[PDB]
Amino acid sequence: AIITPALISALKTSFQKHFQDALATAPSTYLQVATVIPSTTASNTYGWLG
Amino acid sequence: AIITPALISALKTSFQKHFQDALATAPSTYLQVATVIPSTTASNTYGWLG
DSSP states (O other), X not given: OOSXXXXXXXXXXXXXXXXXXXXXXXXXXXXXXXXXXXXXXXXXXXXXXX | OOSOTTGGGGGGOOBOOOSSSOOOXXXXXXXXXXXXXXXXXXXXXXXXXX
C-alpha cells in the first residue's frame, strides 16, 4: 500500500481533453434572411427612386 | 481626429444603386379570364342573331 498516497494523487490521474471544443455555434442563418453587399466607406447610403 | 468630420462626411459615404427598382409588377392574369379582340376604330360594336 501507500502510507501517504496524497502526494501521488497527481500521478494517479489521467487528463483527457475530450470535452475541449466539443461544441459549436448554431448554423449560419443570415444568408436565408439577408444578403451582403458591402462597401468601402463608413455610411453607404442608398438614394433610390420611386 | 478631424475637428469637423461632418464636412468630410462625404468621404465616409458611398452610393451603390442597390435598392433600385427591386420590384416586379404582379404576374399578368387577364389572359386567364379574358381574350383580346382589337379593332382599328373607336367603338368596335358587337351584334347578335339570337
